[PDB]
Design a protein around this nucleic acid. Structure first.
Ligand code: MG
Ligand code: MG
Ligand code: MG
Ligand code: NA
Lengths: 152, 152
DNA sequence: TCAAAACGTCGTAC
DNA sequence: GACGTTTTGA
DNA sequence: TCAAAACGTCGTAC
DNA sequence: GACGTTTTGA
């Protein structure tokens, strides 16, 4: 796992606290044992005319990709291992999004265990609730309650 | 002149590039010799529920203030001397807003001479045009062209 | 006559 | 910014 | 059954 | 985020 430079992390942390997102999702999906996917995403959003900025992020992070949705574009990192490595290093410098970052870390490390028991899986969905609670969440639909209602 | 930590400036630069604004305005105002005020503003916006972040900033920058504006709040720095001192030190770390930062500095250093001649005043106004051209400017009204007419 | 503050509005870029 | 639904390709 | 990508919309918080 | 109009107080 690559070691990121501190100056880079410091600036990136600031910019993430401003225009980034640390996202956790429970995605209803019939092909999973517990009928839901656990989905983590690190994202940085910027007007497409400045997507060169996001393209640099890819070079500097060395992983992830940029997707253009129209007037706006996103840097995206969803790969679990690279995500853990990156957040572990960024986390210390976050001020607005530190708890979310850490909750993500906690979730990733427990995934293996969440696969085993419906209970441990339900607990983990709770951590996702905390992430969403900390964020400026407005259009969320699938929660730990949703999972509890399905595991029956 | 108060001298800021690099760790501080690096994180703040990222956050500014994200959620900050470097604003230059020509404010129509009859009480001025050229019938407009030159206004410089450094601004950071954030949901009012995260005020404390902005309030911390005031302590850390040691100058400026926070204004709650309903559901959103703002850190503001308008005083010219601290603004020059702060921007001079922040500028090396901005990626998105570095050019307007340098333009603000130039304007500040020229203000005195700009008050002497309408021609120099006009030129300075063209630099504020440049700052607005760099920003995601959408509702601008007063430009150097409008100053130009008035001085006629 | 000026620097600075007070207060308000708009259209996205998050 | 922070979600959503559905598809891919193991 | 899964990790990850593809693709889309909502409601502000810039 | 990035403007706008109007007021304060030396
Ligand atoms: Mg923000
Ligand atoms: Mg931004
Ligand atoms: Mg923003
Ligand atoms: Na904006």
């Amino acid at each position: 796992n690559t070691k990121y430079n501190k100056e880079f992390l410091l600036y990136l942390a600031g910019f993430v606290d401003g225009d980034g997102s640390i996202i956790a999702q429970i995605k209803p999906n019939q092909s999973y044992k517990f009928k839901h996917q656990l989905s983590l995403t690190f994202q940085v959003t910027q007007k497409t005319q400045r997507r060169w900025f996001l393209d640099k992020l890819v070079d500097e992070i060395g992983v992830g990709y940029v997707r253009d949705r129209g007037s706006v574009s996103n840097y995206i990192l969803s790969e679990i291992k690279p995500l853990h490595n990156f957040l572990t290093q960024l986390q210390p410098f976050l001020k607005l999004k530190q708890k979310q970052a850490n909750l993500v870390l906690k979730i990733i490390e427990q995934l293996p265990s969440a696969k085993e028991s419906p209970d441990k899986f339900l607990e983990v969905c709770t951590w996702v609730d905390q992430i969403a609670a900390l964020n400026d969440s407005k259009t969320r639909k699938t929660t730990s309650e949703t999972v509890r209602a399905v595991l029956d």
